[PDB]
């Protein structure tokens, strides 16, 4: 009775949201920016190849400064890389080998790992002992951690397989806000440049916009059919692009509260693992399971490049804040720095 | 005369 | 009562999603194009930089 | 010292990868109270050493976390043979763990623990009631051997049709106090590495 | 007249096949990184050695045989006699190396995983080439031209591998017979016999077993005539050159060269894996 009434009310609210989104749209992104100058054939070449890991590389994250990135692999080693000179800065032994995520802090003082151990280990890079040590084992989660993003040095948003997301006061080690909207295992997380909102993607093919201060899902974007493996914010901060296993990539607008354009190809049957955005927001780069990163004009939806340099599945792709270099990581234990 | 061969 | 509480939380979250500000997709697309054209001179990917400016060879 | 750091990091992780190649990592599946803890006679882990060959066990307390285990040596599946109601659930779990998109090259060790409870269940087991296709089946005690062969065929007929020579199941049997699990795991992993090497070194 | 015609036809047939059959293997294995494995590193070195064997043996052992004079110089005679010996050594040792890895994989699989790696495969290839080059270094030193005068009062040359005395010459050919022919003769036999015994104790099983027998028998068949001829001429080269020299030894040396034309066939072109990659590498 009451549960049926609440289900009917939720269905009516979602139907009203869908009707408002359908009535709000009149054109697409392509119909607006069709008659512009394209980026041409981007002859983006493998500038650097990072050959450190000995197992499958699940995730990577670019630093604020262009040179540094961090990569997580199943061997139980977390590796920080210098992209310009192909050097390795930090190799971090992991208590649990099975690690599914890594993150680099905007200020560069901290990296966070997670995985099947159900613990978000915050690693302090700036230590007076002389080595990277665990700063805070965020143990509140009851499932495997899939994505972690640092809002700042004392706040971190994490995603997990327990179907919830949480904001963690790293100083206290306790969840400050818990985001309990997803009905499936949350797989991805992307922060906004102002650090006042974020979007997360889960296994129920739903992307949800959460306010950090409010703690509520302000907007829910349900444009995918498969598990959203990764998500990324457009550099302005008013749109984001996703990627799933259904061979499709969709760009969703925050203000329009809906999707703008699908970035999929008929020649792709495999799944997308990672998506990232260029500096001007006109190239969208998506890693794929066909072993090949496809580069897409983010404003024109044209496959302007194919980054073919990996033997096994591409798992993690990123574009620097400056926009110079794109790094792709793969199941074959290699990271390739492009342009 | 041509009598013999190379070893290999 | 846990299912009823979760359903009421879902109803509250969708009611919070109902009250939101929506702009037209044309204005959002124009803003995306304006940011693209404003930072196109700053983008190293759409237009390739020479090897002196490029830190990668 | 800034380039030698990346060399010394690479030499330290190279020695760590040699030790992980020596270890034959294994994964455990099976439902609750299926006798999975009874198999070990010595994310939870346990270690035991047989004949200068290491084995590592893994069970997680599904399609997303199973992706980490597509490079293990074998999957150890434990089935409670005494109960019949969750036998179909065990069949569905074996179907899900075998016909996996990422697990297309891993053979499945299939232990059938606590066969003694099935032995006094038979000697006291409505096997014709649970399965209507138990009739027209012709294989110590003859009825215990008949039930064991029926369980064996009922659990390998899914693996035989799928797989396609890349990996085939290799079941066993175990009592409550049986200590032949180490030798069975050793022989089964010997055959698994043999069937992989045959393809690796272009003999087949 | 009949005999030179069937000589040139057979020599060219083995030549152009060996040349085509070794350049394809080198192309496919270098370009395709994914294809590369422990045994493929061995097959790649074997293909290069067979290609080196083809180019420095066949035209240099047929044109001087047809014309009955060595028309090239002494430096050509020295440089080519070294590459012929080296290529034979690398080819035979790569076959033994493949058999030893194969024995490790089948008889003792668990123990093998600790040592049998791709880095280990490169070390064996490096040791194979460095040892074969070192042992075949007497070949340029002791091979020089020897001139003779024909019936028409012309000049001619013979490139001959002749040691200073026959006491070292008999011990050389005995040493060469054991390590090149006899030791692989029984090492490849015991290695492929244990593998065949462990597989026999269903029609695909009997496939692999009989192909191992073809490897050892064609090893014997290719190298038995020339190695026996070398042992024959070591102790008495009067009876050997009266019977075999000229047209018969051309066919003996060609059957020996056929090994570098059948090794890609029985190791790569009969692989289901390698044919799928060969159709992918080329458009
Ligand atoms: C032209 C004539 C004088 C012969 C030249 C002799 C060497 C310079 C050649 C012959 C065999 C070649 C080797 C055959 C196989 C390999 C393995 C190959 O390594 C790999 O496969 C890459 C590692 C991987 O598998 O990913 C490339 C180098 C190497 C040593 C080759 C290096 C160059 C070698 C030693």
Author numbering:
A (entry chain B): 2 to 340
B (entry chain P): 1 to 8
C (entry chain G): 6 to 62
D (entry chain A): 18 to 59, 207 to 225, 231 to 254, 265 to 303, 306 to 320, 330 to 394
E (entry chain R): 38 to 238, 305 to 386
Publication passage describing the model:
In the current study, we used the mGsqi chimera in combination with scFv16 to maximise stability of ternary complexes with CCK-8 and CCK1R, where the mGsqi was fused to the receptor carboxyl terminus, which was required for original complex formation. (A) Consensus cryo-EM map of the CCK-8/CCK1R/mGαsqi/Gβ1γ2/scFv16 complex resolved to 2.45 Å (FSC 0.143). For the complex with the Gq mimetic, local resolution was highest for Gβ and Gα subunits that are stabilised by scFv16, with lowest resolution for the extracellular face of the receptor and peptide. Additional focused refinements were performed on the receptor and G protein, leading to substantially improved resolution of these domains that allowed modelling of the Ras domain of the Gα, Gβ, Gγ, CCK1R, and CCK-8, including side-chain rotamers for the receptor with the exception of ICL3 residues 244 to 301 that were poorly resolved and not modelled. As seen with other Gq/11–GPCR complexes, the Gq–αH5 bound to a relatively narrow pocket in the CCK1R core. The rotation inwards of the αH5 of mGsqi places the conserved L393H5.25, much further inwards (7.6 Å), allowing it to sit in a hydrophobic pocket formed by V3116.33 and L3156.37, and in close proximity to R1393.50 of the DRY motif. This shift inwards results in fewer interactions with TM7 and H8, compared to Gαs, with only R3768.49 forming a hydrogen bond to R389H5.21. For mGsqi, the αN helix is rotated outwards from the receptor by approximately 11.5° that is accompanied by a 2.5 Å shift in ICL2 away from the receptor TM bundle. For mGsqi, L147ICL2 also forms interactions within this hydrophobic pocket, which is comprised of L41S1.02, V217S3.01, F376H5.08, and L383H5.15, yet does not bind as deeply.
